[PDB]
Design a protein around this ligand. Structure first.
Ligand SMILES: CCOC(=O)[C@@H](F)[C@@H](O)c1cccnc1
Ligand SMILES: CCOC(=O)[C@@H](F)[C@@H](O)c1cccnc1
Length: 130
């Protein structure tokens, strides 16, 4: 229905706003674009599903996300990719792990404060009807 298409349009507006707020935070710069294969040729052989905030904006606009749960699976993948590629005790690895955990926690805290639980349940029930 038109009303269901208006529901998904409101979901996309919400997700673009959360993603922009993460992308302007200086702590999260390393997560804003894909890894450059020139600078890091090893990356795409270790990490099997790369993800970054520019790719997330592209996916929102391609209508890939019909629920906040499916958006949060991609935020979780940005975080888990950084934890697995950078697992060592040295300061450069510990700094990116702390930033990855902060990106994940910040996204979940904005959604807890600003997403209505009944709006998410509506999106889940339209998705499940298709
Ligand atoms: C693509 C939208 O571009 C902007 O407006 C930026 F300010 C910011 O939103 C941003 C940067 C990088 C990745 N995703 C979002
Ligand atoms: C996931 C679908 O989108 C793509 O594959 C790329 F275009 C995307 O990663 C990208 C990078 C930098 C600037 N704008 C978009």
């Amino acid at each position: 229905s038109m009303q269901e298409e208006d529901t998904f349009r409101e979901l996309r507006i919400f997700l673009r706003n959360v993603t922009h707020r993460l992308a302007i935070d200086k702590r999260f710069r390393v997560f804003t674009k894909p890894v450059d294969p020139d600078e890091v040729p090893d990356y795409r052989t270790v990490i099997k599903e790369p993800m970054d905030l520019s790719s997330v904006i592209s996916k929102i606009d391609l209508h890939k996300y019909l629920t906040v749960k499916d958006y949060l699976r991609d935020i979780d993948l940005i975080c888990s990719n950084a934890l697995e590629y950078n697992p060592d005790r040295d300061p450069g690895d510990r700094l990116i792990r702390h930033r990855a955990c902060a990106l994940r926690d910040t996204a979940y805290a904005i959604i807890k404060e600003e997403l209505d639980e009944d709006f998410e349940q509506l999106c889940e029930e339209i998705q499940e009807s298709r």
